[PDB]
Amino acid sequence: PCPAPCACDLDGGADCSGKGLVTVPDGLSVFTHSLDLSMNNITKLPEGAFKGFPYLEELRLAGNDLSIIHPMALSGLKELKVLTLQNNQLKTVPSESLKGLVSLQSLRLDANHIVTVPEDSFEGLVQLRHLWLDDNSLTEVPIRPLSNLPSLQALTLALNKISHIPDYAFSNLSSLVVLHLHNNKIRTLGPHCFHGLDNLEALDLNYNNLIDFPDSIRSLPNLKELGFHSNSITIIPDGAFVKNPLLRTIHLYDNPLSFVGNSAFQNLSDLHFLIIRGASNVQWFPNLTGTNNLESLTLTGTKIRSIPIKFCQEQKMLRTLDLSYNEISALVGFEGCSSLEEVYLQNNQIQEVQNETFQGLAALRMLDLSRNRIHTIHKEAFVTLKALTNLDLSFNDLTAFPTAGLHGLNQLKLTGNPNFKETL
Template sequence: DSFIHPEAFSGLHQLKVLMLQNNQLKTVPNSALKNLHSLQSLRLDANHITTVPDDSFESLQQLRHLWLDDNNLMEVPVGSLRHQANLRALTLALNRILYIPDNAFANLTSLVVLHLHNNRINEIGDNCFSGLVNLETLDLNFNNLKVFPKAIQALPKLKELGFHSNDIASIPEGAFHNNPLLKTIHLYDNPLSFVGASAFQNLSSLHSLMLRGASMMQDFPILTWTNNLESLTLSGTKISSIPTDLCEDLKVLRTLDLS
């Protein structure tokens, strides 16, 4: 269906899950959602949505999970997310988003999971993730980012970070110093030529680091106090030597790929 009558769900005051995926919707049926005060999960994925009116989810104060992936969105629907303080998971993947502005998710203080993969994002504001104080999973894989996303410094509880398959050439010094809880970093398939010496230091929670396909990378990353690493993938790089104290520093390492 491409149209949902404004009264289609009237009277469903106890409705908790609404699945509208795989339809022909071009916009969020905001009028039909007006009185669904108990709704916790809303699926709008796999439609043709290009616009999300600012008042779309205004009355959905209990909303926990929102799927907007696989649509035709050109931008983050900032206005419609302003009232979602209880949202835990949001996916905007598989759209056509080019840019993430500052404070795009500022009021989503309960958000734990954010999927932005498979868009066309080539730039993000340095403060675009401010307010996401509880975010644990961030997926920026398969985009067009050219610069390391400094905005992740606003994410103190981040555990899983993916921005593989982008166009990032360098990882700055202290890149993750504000993300001490990181467990996995997937950076592979980026044209990395520079990795700051301190970039991966002091990440005592880190279990998995994937830098596969960093074809210009020549120096082995310094992993001082990143001593719980279990899996390290450095295949397809130009690294020619391994630190002599590697085994001493990485006592729990199970997988080392230098192919």
Template sequence: LSVFPYSDLSMNNITKLPSNPVHNLRFLEELRLAGNGLTYIPKGAFAGLFSLKVLMLQNNQLRQVPTEALQNLRSLQSLRLDANHINYVPPNCFNGLVSLRHLWLDDNSLTEIPVEAFRSLPALQAMTLALNKIHYIPDYAFGNLSSLVVLHLHNNRIYSLGKKCFDGLHSLETLDLNYNSLDEFPTAIRTLTNLKELGFHSNNIKSIPERAFVGNPSLITIHFYDNPIQLVGKSAFQHLPELRTLTLNGASQITEFPDLTGTTSLESLTLTGAQITSLPKSACDQLPNLQVLDLSYNLLEDLPCFTACKKLQKIDLHHNEIGEIKADTFRQLAALRSLDLAWNKIKIIHPNAFSSLPSLIKLDVSSNLLSSFPVTGLHGLTHLKLTGNHALQSLISSENFPELKVMEMPYAYQCCAFGACESHYKISSQWNKDENSSIDDFHRKDAGLLQIQDEREFEDFFLDFEEDLKAHHSVQCSPSPG
């Protein structure tokens, strides 16, 4: 028995431990006591466990950290105290745990950070204090945790941070402040020079200041959605060379496109629901690696040339005030696959506007003011939306769209050029024969088209039908004639 490296006593309705129950298990490396009814652990309960590396005490009824029982577990690397009722962490409770790397204190009843208790954990690399009742983080709260890499503080009641609360966290790479009550941007993060992932979504933050992340050049990911952010400093996201994704929805007071100097690795940029009226001509010079651009629901009137954004694959510009697409607007975007220009005021599209887009397969110019539509360069399209352009009454030849699978036209008669007038009922009958519910599914999805939002809008909706359409070698054109 003394040579067993592992012992699982979880879920055994144990309510009490004797003072010397496992003293002879000197080679034991992992002890599981989770899911019992322990309210107290006496001194000496783990005496003699010189090799113990993992101790699991989660899901019990403990009200404070068992200080005396934990003394001198010098080999302990992982300690789970989560899902108890702990409301007090004694100042010296972790003394002697010189090897501890992972500490779980989440899902307890803590109301403050146990600053003194954390001063004796030099090897700690990951800690979670999430799902507690902590409301404030004082200065130097984690001052001695120089090895800490991951810190979770989400789902607390934190409304305020000391300006130096994160001082000393020289190795921190992940900080989670999501689901708290912060009213102001956490400027204390500026001391975290190695921070790579930051989350402060689902708070009450209303603005992001100028140079907000000036001390965090290693940031790769920032999560800050579900905040009532209205104002963002123009320089807020400068000099973040590792940042890959930036998403900001509904910042209604933003009137200028942000200065993204030095943020050269950005691959996805979403700035929707703002009041941006124009884009700088140098926007693409700052974003050479951009693949996805979403500027929908703004007030854009004119567009610059996007040629320098050579890696762009998807552009969403729907719901703006754009009036014209020039010859060079999208010139030589060889990787562009999806372009959404719906719900603008476009009257004119230059005949060669789409002539150098060899990868374009999805184009939406619905609900504009077009009276003519250029077809040059669109031979690879599989999905096309022109509905809502009431002045566009001419027929469009199917010869210009040999790959087209799905399209929406302003008028039903325009679908005749794609064989819809002759084959509509035949195809419907065939679909009924091949798949009992395919037509019902189609109508359900068709009726919900305008409700599809964000990244499923238009592009992903039509992808659902692509395989079926290939099988029938037919163009699905709406509105259906007859």
């Protein structure tokens, strides 16, 4: 049942993987469930080389030298649910060969040289779920080929050369939950580029060339997760997220944000993770109601001097807080947000700290106060903080080191303080 080079398993899978083979091995069982041809030298495929396998559900050609594929090279697989073509030499989408894989739920064309997509690509695949186009030479989003995929739940166009996303490019994919555009060249988004996708919960625009805020996302009522980081965006309007009330996670960092509406982050009750970094010119804080449910907050690279009392009355969910690398000169009491396990205050201008500031925080393992100006610390401040394995006081102006308990902590960094008494 199993020809020499391959190996055949319990469930009817046959691994010809990594055999240095130029052609489909002959002698394989016709009851083969799965076939793995990955990592071989197969340069080309002949007519119907898979026709003798009627039951074959999964076909892995990943990582071969395959350049072109005869239109009929797969005919006999109407039961095929998954086809992995990744890491091969394809300069184009094998449109004709994909005619009549009518059962196909997974198509990986990612990591090829693909420049062009023939207009009729993916015409019959009505069952397709996952389409991987990424890591290719794609110059534009293939509107026609994607109009044939009403079942698609997930798509990656990432790591291509795309510069612009036309209006209604995704218009026919209503089942789509996940759209990945990251690491393209995109400079321009049509106002209607995202129209039609009312099920999309996840959008990746990261590592692109964007400049305006992408208000196209107003077409996305189901949006949960949004990345726009590493772009050129200069402005986050108030009204930015108004039409996306379900957002849990926003990644905005690595943009030259010169401006952020104070209220841009208002009224997001599902928002658990908010990351803002390296916004150089942005001078100030968020309004942040009705967002009380925030889990992790990162705000760094700015001018803010301080934080409101309401902050820890209203956020009872907050676990990690990264305020580092700001201009902050002062600190409110943190007792309120009881869920705090991590607080990073380092590289600010803060001068002093009191007792109750860190009072009643049970779960806090990590506190980084390092690289500040702090000239003194009250003796009873850290008495209350357990779980604490890491306290970084290093690189301040302080002349005397507090306790306790600093006893039993795994790390206490006191380095770089001008401690006059110890020098003696």
